[PDB]
Design an enzyme around this catalytic site. Structure first.
Site, PDB file in Angstrom:
ATOM      1  N   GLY A 186       0.895  -1.265   0.038  1.00  0.00           N
ATOM      2  CA  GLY A 186      -0.011  -0.104   0.092  1.00  0.00           C
ATOM      3  C   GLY A 186       0.904   1.054   0.036  1.00  0.00           C
ATOM      4  O   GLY A 186       1.961   1.039  -0.166  1.00  0.00           O
ATOM      5  N   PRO A 187       0.382   2.318   0.107  1.00  0.00           N
ATOM      6  CA  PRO A 187       1.037   3.781   0.308  1.00  0.00           C
ATOM      7  C   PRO A 187       1.888   3.655   1.551  1.00  0.00           C
ATOM      8  O   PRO A 187       1.622   3.050   2.512  1.00  0.00           O
ATOM      9  CB  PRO A 187       0.036   4.830   0.246  1.00  0.00           C
ATOM     10  N   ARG A 188       2.900   4.627   1.532  1.00  0.00           N
ATOM     11  CA  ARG A 188       4.020   4.957   2.546  1.00  0.00           C
ATOM     12  C   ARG A 188       3.465   5.572   3.534  1.00  0.00           C
ATOM     13  O   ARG A 188       3.704   6.773   3.748  1.00  0.00           O
ATOM     14  CB  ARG A 188       5.303   5.330   1.929  1.00  0.00           C
ATOM     15  N   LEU A 189       2.132   5.593   4.138  1.00  0.00           N
ATOM     16  CA  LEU A 189       1.518   6.292   5.082  1.00  0.00           C
ATOM     17  C   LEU A 189       1.197   5.628   6.240  1.00  0.00           C
ATOM     18  O   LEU A 189       0.969   4.357   6.293  1.00  0.00           O
ATOM     19  CB  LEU A 189       0.030   6.851   4.525  1.00  0.00           C
TER      20      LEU A 189
END
Length: 116
Positions: free
Chosen positions: A28-31
């Site tokens: 997934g996103p780097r959040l």
């Protein structure tokens, strides 16, 4: 009215898609995790309570709105070593108080028919 375009956005809950793959597939996103949940929750809440389970369902299994073109909306598909069945189970819990804790058509935080 609970149809993509109408009461539900086209390609709904984009952030929930990623929040779900982060957990089940590990991609997934780097959040930060809390940031990923918030954004999905925020998106699910912008949808009228009566359409929340349907939105979830479109995200899990997709929907094909009628019309000349009309492309496939939503749906979780297989990712290398992360079967669609694995992501579905987790996606069905999003409304839950464990997750976003959002009321639906029943006025309670649950979508009884969604999964399977």
């Amino acid at each position: 009215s609970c149809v993509p375009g109408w009461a539900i956005p086209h390609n709904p809950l984009p952030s929930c898609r990623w929040y779900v793959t982060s957990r089940t597939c590990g991609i997934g996103p780097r959040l930060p995790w809390p940031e990923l949940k918030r954004r999905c929750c925020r998106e699910l809440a912008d949808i009228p309570a009566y359409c929340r389970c349907t939105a979830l369902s479109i995200l899990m299994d997709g929907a094909i709105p009628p019309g000349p073109d009309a492309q496939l909306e939503g749906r979780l598909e297989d990712l290398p070593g992360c079967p669609r069945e694995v992501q579905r189970g987790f996606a069905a819990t999003l409304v839950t108080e464990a997750e976003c804790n959002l009321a639906t058509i029943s006025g309670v935080a649950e979508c009884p028919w969604i999964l399977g």
